[PDB]
Amino acid sequence: GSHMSKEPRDPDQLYSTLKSILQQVKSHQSAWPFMEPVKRTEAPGYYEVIRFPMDLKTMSERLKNRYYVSKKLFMADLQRVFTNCKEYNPPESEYYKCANILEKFFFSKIKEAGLIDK
């Protein structure tokens, strides 16, 4: 419209922004793994590498519980899903690149949602 639309701040405007975003990131194919937490072991030495495994599920669920009271909180979690994906999963394993794929989309989401601030 004509408002700020670049600085959410409020834990509500954020929560659901981040809620709809996470939704969209998750909606974004590339966020197919981050969606649900990994088996920690079915995963080829994943938890052995991934000292920081976050999943969009826990994200929107934490976000649900009203944990995304901060724009970046949301991020550290989403950004995190991407991190672990890039941490172990190769950029050719369809996993990592996915991180980068959605993370890109996700990037347009946040910046659009005035979230992202780097």
């Binding site: 649900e36 990994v38 995963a43 050719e92 394993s93």
Partner: peptide, 15 residues
């Protein structure tokens, strides 16, 4: 338990 994930994880074919 009884989770239906999609992360193939186990090396088999992802690209």
């Amino acid at each position: 338990a009884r989770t239906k994930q999609t992360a193939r994880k186990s090396t088999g074919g992802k690209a």
